[PDB]
């Protein structure tokens, strides 16, 4: 029994763990892991409301793995369930496959096309190709590569080649035209 809390790459936003309680004025704090820290209201930035929950701006915890609110009440101390902190991104700066310029090939000649996406961090990436293959991850900037490969290249493979990268809530693509000539002479 646990909760989940997402954060964007553009931090400095504000977040609310639903530590909802009845008592309009409790000595309630927000303990964290990891590393084991423990936060307290200050009016200005931090706060805990009885029926609103514990409040704090993202960048203040984006490093932690899980947070939970805890209240000191005399005898023993009682706490909420575990909320899991999760930083995620979406910014795809660009996608470009090597080579960018056209390609004139010869039948049977091995073809390898590197497709390269530069993203911010904590980005997940899905690759999708359009045309008539293996990919791996690699500044505050990530780079994923998707390499398409054919050996026995026929004349029919002479189509436009499209790589597209989707980060979740965004997508970019680049392309290149390739022609498969028959062995000359």
């Amino acid at each position: 029994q646990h909760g989940v809390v997402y954060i964007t790459e553009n931090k400095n936003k504000t977040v609310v763990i639903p530590c909802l309680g009845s008592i309009s004025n409790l000595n309630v704090s927000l303990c964290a892991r990891y590393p084991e820290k423990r936060f307290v209201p200050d009016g200005n930035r931090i706060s805990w409301d009885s029926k609103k929950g514990f409040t704090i701006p993202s960048y203040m915890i984006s490093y932690a793995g899980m947070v939970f609110c805890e209240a000191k009440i005399n005898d023993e101390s009682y706490q909420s369930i575990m909320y899991i902190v999760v930083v995620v991104g979406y910014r795809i700066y660009d996608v470009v496959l090597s080579p960018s310029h056209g390609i004139e090939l010869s039948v049977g000649e091995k073809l390898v096309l590197n497709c390269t996406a530069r993203t911010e961090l904590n980005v997940g990436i899905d690759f999708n190709w359009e045309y008539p293959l293996v990919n791996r991850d690699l500044s505050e900037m990530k780079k994923f590569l998707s390499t398409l490969t054919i050996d026995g290249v026929t004349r029919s493979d002479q189509g436009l080649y499209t790589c597209a990268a989707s980060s979740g809530l965004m997508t970019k693509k680049n392309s290149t035209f390739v022609r498969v000539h028959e062995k000359p002479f």
Partner: protein
């Protein structure tokens, strides 16, 4: 506070030692997801041999299973079992 000799020896010989391994080191293709935690503790052949011409290799391997959170950014998540390779017996061997 100075370590004995034969202690350093045995504490250091080619044997299964707990190691922190990146998941994407094991599953390099899963670039669409992201994992929490992002790495895992696994026995791997560690320590050194008594001869230049040797290398500390495994002679017994076994995947093990742990609860990881798979996360498809902006589309969901869940906590599933992931199997990971482990070393059980280590051995110094020719290179």
């Amino acid at each position: 506070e100075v370590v004995k000799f034969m202690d350093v020896y045995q504490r250091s010989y080619c044997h299964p030692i707990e190691t922190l391994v990146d998941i994407f080191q094991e599953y390099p293709d899963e670039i669409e997801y992201i994992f929490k935690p992002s790495c895992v503790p696994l026995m791997r052949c560690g320590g050194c041999c008594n001869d230049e011409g040797l290398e500390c290799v495994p002679t017994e391997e076994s995947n093990i299973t742990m609860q990881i959170m798979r996360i498809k950014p902006h589309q969901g998540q869940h906590i599933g079992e992931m199997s990971f390779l482990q070393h059980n017996k280590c051995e110094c061997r020719p290179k």
